[PDB]
Each structure stands twice: as structure tokens, then as C-alpha cells.
Amino acid sequence: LCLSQQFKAQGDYILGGLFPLGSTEEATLNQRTQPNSIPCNRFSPLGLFLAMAMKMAVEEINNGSALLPGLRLGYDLFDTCSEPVVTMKSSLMFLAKVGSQSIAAYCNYTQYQPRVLAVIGPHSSELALITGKFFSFFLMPQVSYSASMDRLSDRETFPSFFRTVPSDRVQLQAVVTLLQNFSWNWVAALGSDDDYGREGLSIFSSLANARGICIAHEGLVPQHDTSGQQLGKVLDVLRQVNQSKVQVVVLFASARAVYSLFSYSIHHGLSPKVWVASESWLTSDLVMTLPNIARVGTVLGFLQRGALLPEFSHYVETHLALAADPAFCASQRCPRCDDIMLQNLSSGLLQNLQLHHQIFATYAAVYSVAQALHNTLQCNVSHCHVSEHVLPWQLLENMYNMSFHARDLTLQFDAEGNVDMEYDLKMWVWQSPTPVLHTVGTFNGTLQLQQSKMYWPGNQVPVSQCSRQCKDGQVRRVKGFHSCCYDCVDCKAGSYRKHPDDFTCTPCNQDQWSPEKSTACLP
Amino acid sequence: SDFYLPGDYLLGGLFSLHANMCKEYEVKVIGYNLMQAMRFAVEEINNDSSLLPGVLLGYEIVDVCYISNNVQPVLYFLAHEDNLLPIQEDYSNYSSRVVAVIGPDNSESVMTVANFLSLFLLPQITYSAISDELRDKVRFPALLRTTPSADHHIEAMVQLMLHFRWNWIIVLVSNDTYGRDNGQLLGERVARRGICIAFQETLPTLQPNQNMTSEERQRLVTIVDKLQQSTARVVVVFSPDLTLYHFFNEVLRQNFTGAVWIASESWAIDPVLHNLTELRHLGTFLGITIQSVPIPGFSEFRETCNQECDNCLNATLSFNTILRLSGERVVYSVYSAVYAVAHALHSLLGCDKSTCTKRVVYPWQLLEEIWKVNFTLLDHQIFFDPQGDVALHLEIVQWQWDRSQNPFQSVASYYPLQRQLKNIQDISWHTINNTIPMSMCSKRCQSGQKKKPVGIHVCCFECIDCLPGTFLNHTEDEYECQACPNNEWSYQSETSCFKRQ
Secondary structure (H helix, E strand, O other): OOHHHOOEEOOOEEEEEEEOOEEOOHHHHOOOOOOOOOOOOEEOHHHHHHHHHHHHHHHHHHHOOOOOOOOOEEEEEEEOOOOHHHHHHHHHHHHOEOOOOEEEOOOOOOOOOEOOOEEEOOOOHHHHHHHHHHHHHHOOOEEEOOOOOHHHHOOOOOOOEEEOOOOHHHHHHHHHHHHHHOOOOEEEEEEEOOHHHHHHHHHHHHHHHHHOOEEOOOOEEOOOOOOOOHHHHHHHHHHHHHHOOOOEEEEEOOHHHHHHHHHHHHHHOOOOOEEOOOHHHHOOHHHHOOOOHHHHOEEEEEEEOOOOOOHHHHHHHHHHHHHHOHHHHOOOOOOOHHHOOOHHHHHHHHOOOOHHHHHHHHHHHHHHHHHHHHHHOOOOOOOOOOOOOOOHHHHHHHOOOOOEEEOOEEEOEOOOOOEOOOEEEEEEEOOOOOOEEEEEEEEOOOEEEOHHHOOOOOOOOOOOOOEOOOOOOEEOOEEOOOOOEEOOEEOOOOEEEOOOOOOOEEEOOOOOEOOOOOOOOEO | OOOEEOOOEEEEEEEOOEOOOHHHOOEOHHHHHHHHHHHHHHHHHHHOOOOOOOOOEEEEEEEOOOOOOOOHHHHHHHOOOOOEEEOOOOOOOOOOOEEEEEEOOOHHHHHHHHHHHOOOOOOEEEOOOOOHHHHOOOOOOOEEEOOOOHHHHHHHHHHHHHHOOOOEEEEEEEOOHHHHHHHHHHHHHHHOOOOEEEEEEEEOOOOOOOOOOHHHHHHHHHHHHHHHHOOOOEEEEEOOHHHHHHHHHHHHHOOOOOEEEEEOOOOOOOHHHHOOHHHHHHEEEEEEEEOOOOOOOHHHHHOOOOOOOOOHHHHHHHHHHHHHHOOOOOHHHHHHHHHHHHHHHHHHOOOOOOOOOOOOOOHHHHHHHHOOOEEEEOOEEEEEOOOOEEOOOEEEEEEOOOOOOOOEEEEEEEEOOOOEEEOOOOOOOOOOOOOOOOOOOOOOOOOOEEEEEOOOOOOOEEEEEOOOOEEOOOOOOOOOOEEOOOOEEOOOOOOOOEEOO
């Protein structure tokens, strides 16, 4: 096949790209003894579609005149191989001098001549951190699909990182708004053991305090029963869920982990809580296929809403056919990509596409960079002011105030490099034997609810709440992970409420008595 | 100047001289002290003909701000004498200017440098970067440390709490990664040992020489109020030194008193905080830190960009007396790191202790040797764990404000190879008769009086009398009363039954 060569094109300006186009098997992961290169020995199915989407966007931009009239846009694609060393070698190549094999060391780089205009970012968020801290020092603009962590928001460490997908923070803003609307003031919060769940717990634990929601208990939960302890601690988490008498659980984790938890909940029956876990869990088949799952009570979550580009599947099949045709072959970007057949990949995945979202994102990403160049060259309908070669740090000046269009959807980067985007609120309805994801709302910065379309298990609204101040004749006790709620005890007869701010009762003398909830000792 | 010395082989030094262009921020005393530690070590190697005869061990140094000015010095180190760094598939034959890097202090800077150096396997030794993830040699193959991990600091804190029976505590963390994960780690340890954590709060990361807004001030009030109202009189603080200057002032403003403050290594031995006289009135200050090792004569020595510091000398001269009066703790980490590189190079060149066969050294060849060094330096053996740590002892320092003798008195020692706290000494408390200060959720119950838990926290319980005809078999249960055998009866709250008609 010609596929490994199809990932490159010439032009007046060139885009770099980092995609999950390959991987290496476990034997390669051993601690390296010598700085040899990495044998990324096998193909990857998703990266192929991401690369094809980038190619499609660039092809449309070259064919049309809505952007960059009169000049040609090229690209070079590299595989991340999910490996920081390979990612870093590929990243370093982008900054090398024009048409040259080396990179110069200088005190500052607002004086320099790198070989690409912008980088379409890596898939995984950890590689996004690793590569962003490097790229932004060169002030090269890097536009990333995926990579939703809030860490990359801060401009002081990542002055040049942009992304075309909403971050975790806005999703959790929507979640906390859902909690606020139904007065679910007293909740538990859980999260996976990776940085994804770590930052989920952290973001929620900050926003809830900022918005007056008291977390009953935190919790980091294991990925799977990989070791003898993890069969156990999940049950202690569930014991705390029952002891806190919570009804609503927030759970920011991937489906496999939630599936584990769910199965444990099923084993012991638990009780029908409400679960507000993330879309990664709301989407995954292996969860709703649990036969007993209706016992889980109630499932809610926010799912990202986005456009369609229907031409894409036919485009993939077209260029795979061209990759196979020797007449096209007769006319290095990924090794070993050429050895896997067309059919079981194309017909297998294209009939089964959250991975759809990343197509649109990877499309929109290119359209951002091109638009920025279109703005930086100050193009008229007829011509562009390309009398001088633009440098990457110049685009970064414009990218913050632009707006760009993608398939009749319209976008812009905010002051911290995100794009604002909207969600559906989808609840699982399973009075039908097959569980059905069902729309019951929308989030576009404030929560809109279609109250009628929600079927609570008892046909009545669940609640979990806590008293935020006690009455006069009551004794406080603080509760919550941040000491946020109070639970109140009526002070028993024969003792009295010492004073209206105490945490203690006080006995009355032998000769005298006090009513229940009294403040005084009386004849 | 202080920042360069030629030689046959260069070390690369990365030190944080300015806190907050990196030069424009306020200077740090400790950073210049550590830089002098490295310089003195290299001078000694050049004096010592027994270690590297006829070979000039040089050094080149660059200031790296707290989490800024990274990347640039790494490029300066890896680029060749023509200032160009060539891109290659395989770097086995490549020869950087420096042969080793004495890496940054902050963990995030250390990782930012490691993700770069792992590409070339340039050996990197970091002092004081305690983050636990740095043990992952799959992720950081070229990185070693001359200090124990954060695991051992948390273990020292927990065993200190166990010794004095402080099963009811409060934890404060800075609103950044260092605070966040250290609080997570302390919670993970605590839940396993029967200690209870009253609550956890996140401090705002206020700049010490900067004005404070209304909301930040109200946040500080909201935290210190929870401190004042809660029964837990032990407070553990995980924060960079910089942020705390504002916090404690507010604590002083609130008339707060009588707590035991447990400090993490990031501020446990900071002179700048110690010099605040009024901290005496907040209670007892304890902190976990690396051991003290007296260098032989360090004080008499202490008397293309970012390779300069103008303010360092005059700033440090104001602290010089307390610095000399204090011990040498992290200075030993820097000193032993340079000595580790020196021994590794000494054996790699195969020098015979009379003459050395000078050779082109590829960094990975030195990295594979730095793991096998095992030697005495000031009576301590230094050798590296398979995961990369040198197992230096930790010590617990009480803050003392008599300016005449010593600011940080060691009251305990901690052995990480044995994972045990030992040699606890006469701490002098704030209490009225020097009796050990106490924090517990609720006091131990009477005999014959069963427990009933009050909440999530295992430590908290009501005590309920067993009704007559039942007794509390203290040896077999705690939360219910056995019924007396039918031939016997019981006087309400009692552990036993009596024969009766």
C-alpha cells in the first residue's frame, strides 16, 4: 500500500501533526539502556481516521477560495506512538531550521526560523502537557483535539496551547449546576486513579465549595482488580457511601472502573442511588449490558453535542482504495501502517463510530490554523499579503481574538485557549428492556431542563440534603470532607442548651429541672 | 564569575536563585547557598588528587526560576560547541557539552527537564525533589535523587502522630500540585493506621510581597475560623514556603494559640519564616527535614543568559550568621550528588589514582555507572536504590527562637531503610506544665460501657452503658453487650455477671 507516503504534501506553508498512528508492544517498554530509537512495530486504527480527517480539511481548504486564496497549504504528519521519547523526537523535528537537520540554542526565540507553521496536537493529555511545555517556549501555536485537562488552561506555563474541545472544568460546571437545580446539597464524589480522575475530584471539590455544596466524602477508586488490595477497598468506599447516608454520587471515571464498582454494588444489593458520572461512563456498552444493572437506581450525564461531516467515511474508503491501487502507487510517516488490510478496518469501525467527535475536532483544528493565517496575511477576497514569510509566533497574536467556521458551526478561542461548546443532558431510561439514553435537557452555560421527560424510580424526585445551621435548642456536629454541613441533636430533657453557639449540652441541678430543648434550668 | 569554571569535563548545574525575565524576581537565600555547596564540592574534587588526578572537573551553572526558564538551559547543555543540536534517530555516539546535570529542586521543573534528558539519557541527579512519581524508572530512566521520597516524609509525620497519640488532626494544602498530591498521600497513609483527619482545606497561593484582595482575605478568615472552632489541635501544612507568610499573619490576627504545627520539608527549615518573632505565640512548631551533616569547612568558603546574580551576596550576608549557626542539611544533598558524579566518572575513566586516561565520554555510559557507586562521604554510605534514592536519614526539628545557639533543634530521627522513627527527645511544649498537648475526637470510654460510632470517623464514639443482665466482654467486642448466662445477672455497666437467686 501507498498509505505511509500519503501523509505528506507540499505547500507555501506547512502544518505539523501528532497522531496516534502507531504503537509498540510491551517488550519495548523496558527501561532503556542506550539512546536507540523506538521500534513502533504495529498499526493503529483510530489514528488513521484522525490523519484522514486532517487531510480532508486541508484538501478542502486548498480546493476552495473561502480561505488563503492563491497559496497552497501543506502538511507533515508524525506518529506519537503513545511514547514520550518518540513524541519528543517528532516534536523536536518541527522546530529545526528551515530545510535543515538541526536546532539552534538561543537565549530567546522571537528571532528564529522553524520549519512548520503550527502543530495539530497530540491525542493523550499527558503527551499534551509534555509537548506543550516545550512548544510554548518557542511560542509555536499548538491546536489539540482531545486533551481536556484544566492544567493546560493556565497561560503562564502554556502561552501557546489551544484546543478545539471543551475542558473538564465546563463539564463539571454543568454537573454542579445540575446538583444546584435539584437541591442535591449533600453528595459523595469519586474519581479514577489516573490524572483524569485526580483532576476530576480536585475540580469538583473546588467548585462545590465555591458554590455551597458539601461533599460527604472524597474518593480515589481503582481502575480494576489488578492486585489483591483492589478487590477490597471498593467495598470500604461503598461502606462510606452507606454510612454518610448520601443519595447522590458524582463519579468522574472511565467505564471499566465504574463497571467494577457497579458489579460490586450489584453483588450486595446496596440501594437505588443517583449516579451523575461522566460521559466516558455514560457511553460505554460494557456497563449497560450488566443484566442486573436496573438496581443501580438512576443514571444522569452530560454528553457533548457536535456537527456531522458525512463525506468522511466515503473519503476514507476512497483513499484506502487509492492506497491499494498499484496505478496510484506508481505515481516513512508511519512504519508498518501498510501491512493491514482495508476491509476489516473500514467496514468494522465506520459502522460503529465518542470517536466521531474527534473527527470534527480534528477537522475544526485545521480550520482554526488556516483561518489564523488567513487573518495574519490580511487576505482580501482576491489576494493575500504574503510579500514576507510569516513566523509561528505571529499567528499566536491573532488566534486569541479570531472566530472560525466549521461545517456551519462557528467557534472561537477564549482568553485561556478553550472553545466554548454545549451539551445534552441524557438520562438512562430502562422501562424498556433495552436501556435507552434519552435527552432531558441542555447546557449552554446555564442548565435548561425538560422536567416532564425524567422518570425517577419511585416517580418522585430523589433528595440528599444537610442542615447548614441548627436551630436554637439544638447541638451542632460538623460533618463533611471540608467541615461544611451540620447535623443537629435535640438536647435531651434534664439537660439544656448552654448557650446559642455551643457544641454541647449542660446538666441541670438536683433541685431543678429542664424541658427538652430548653436553654435554662428551672424550678 | 561564580557561574562557570572550565575543565576537561563539565557538570551542568540548575539552581533556583530567584523565587517569584527570571532576573526580575526577588532573590532566595537558600538557592545561593546550594549553589555554593556545588561550587565548593567541585573545588574540593580539584584539590583531591586521590579522586581525579590531573583531570579538571569543571562546572557551568544556570539560574532556573521556580517553574520558569526551563527548556533553555537544557538546550544550552545538549547543544554542541557550535551551538547547534543535531536531530538524530540514535544518539549513542553523540557527545554533549556537559556529562551530567545536577538538576532542579522543584518536582515540576525536574520532570520538565527529565522528559527532555531521557531522550539522550544524560544522567541527572536532583536534590530535594521528593515527588513520589520520580521513582518510576519506566517514565524517568535517567533520574536519581540524593534525598528520600515523599513516602518517607509522610511516614515520619504519621509515626510522630502515633508516638504522642494524636489520632485527630487537620490538614492544610496549597492550591497546587505539591500540596494536592501530598495531602492525598497523607490521607492514604492515615486511613491505614487508625488516625482520623478532622477536615482538609486548600490555601490560596498568595505571593508574599503582593497585595491581597477581599475574597482572598475572606478565604483566609474562613479557614482560620474552622481552625479555631475545631477540637483537633494538630495542624499539618503542605505548602511552598512562599505562600505561608500571609497565612500565619492572619492566624496571628485571629488571636489563635495552642496548636502543634507540623511542617513539610518545603518550609520546615526556612529562615525567612523562622525570623518572624511572633510565631512563638501560636504554639509548637515541628518539621520533617533531611538529616544534618557538618561539612568540613563550608562556612569559611561561604564567607549565555541567566548566569548571574547581583543581589545574592548582599541578601545572604543578612542571613550569614543564622546560616552558620544552623546546620547543613540540603547542602549535603548537593555535595554528595557532585561526589557521586565524581566517583562514577572516576571509575568510568578507570583512573588508577595516580593518572587518568582522558577519553571521550558519552553520557549514557556514565549513567549506567552512576547506579553502581557505593562509598563513604562524611561517614555516611551513599548508594542508590534500584528506584534511584539515597537512603539518608530524616530528622524532626522543633523551632527554637533563642538566637544564640540554634534555630532548628533536632528532637527525633527517622530511619527510612528501617522505616522507623527513633531517638525522640525532650520536646518543650506550649502547655501549662509541659505536659504533652492532646487531640482526640472523643475520650476513651469507661469500663463496661460500649461504644457507638458517631460518624464516618472511626475515632468518634458515644459511650453507652450496658443495661442490666448484659455485660461488655471487652476482650471480644466493643459495640454490643453479651447477655449474662441465665444463672447470672449484671449491675448495668459491668464486664461480668454474678450468681443470683
